[PDB]
Design a protein around this ligand. Sequence first.
Ligand SMILES: CCN1CCN(C(=O)N[C@@H](C(=O)N[C@@H](C=O)[C@@H]2N[C@@H](C(=O)O)C(C)(C)S2)c2ccccc2)C(=O)C1=O
Length: 322
Amino acid sequence: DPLSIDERLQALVYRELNNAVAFNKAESGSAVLVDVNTGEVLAMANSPGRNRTITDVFEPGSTVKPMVVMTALQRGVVRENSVLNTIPYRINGHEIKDVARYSELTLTGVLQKSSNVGVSKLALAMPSSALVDTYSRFGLGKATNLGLVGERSGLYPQKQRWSDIERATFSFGYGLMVTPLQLARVYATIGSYGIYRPLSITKVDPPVPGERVFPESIVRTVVHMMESVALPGGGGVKAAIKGYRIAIKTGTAKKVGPDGRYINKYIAYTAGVAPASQPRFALVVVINDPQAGKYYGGAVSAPVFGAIMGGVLRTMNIEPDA
Ligand SMILES: CCN1CCN(C(=O)N[C@@H](C(=O)N[C@@H](C=O)[C@@H]2N[C@@H](C(=O)O)C(C)(C)S2)c2ccccc2)C(=O)C1=O
């Protein structure tokens, strides 16, 4: 009753998640929905119910990329209209390449096409501490404190010195492990334009004072850029919702084994905020080990993200902004 969960939104999330997990023949799926102004968890669901995926840890992969662009802008490595050389290259034999090859991309392009090359060149242009600092500001490598077992088990680098390959892979979301709850908190901080708040499972009266972790102007710039992910040419186009602008990012990660080996099992993500013009909600959707033939975030997680976010916007009577 001081519980923040809105059961209308919980039931919607559960139903859509159940359907997506079944359709993709996946092990499981999770969705976490957060009010970006208060940190209230409005919905939090695992499918199947007893697969406690919301508190399991995973490499966040390309979902970290918006923070990379924010950091490069803050440090003056790039400007709003910058164009990056995105030609694939090598680091000591390690090949850095994108799924789709481009010789150059704008910062919007880098997010739209999810360019590993583009973000890695940004990272190598900055000290190793730069992204460590930003990810930390957004709450990665800090526990969530909702009182759920597992909440605290994420892996985050405490390293003093970094190799070139480590710095690059960090920029596209490997070499650290986070829970869906931590990722939802990142995106809630994006939706607030740089105000960090802890997640709450209990009701609060707004406004809720938070911690300014990043300038409003920078976060707003990248939120606009993320709108391209949900338009034609963008990886998350299947999340698009009629009448609304959404700001999202897709991701796909190969699962790492305990000996550090990557296996042919996938984790698919879509994380974002809506409506993009003035965010009310942050949503993270994770689909664990899809087996039905598709495994990219845009194919597997983006459709259910659109169905959930669309249902939320309608239920909460949010004014169409498209
Ligand atoms: C550190 C070693 N190691 C770990 C494994 N690994 C990795 O799993 N790579 C994935 C990757 O690059 N992931 C995405 C970030 O999420 C990019 N965005 C995706 C999206 O938007 O869905 C995309 C369009 C599919 S590519 C990938 C690429 C292609 C297919 C599946 C997964 C690495 O690359 C990597 O170096």
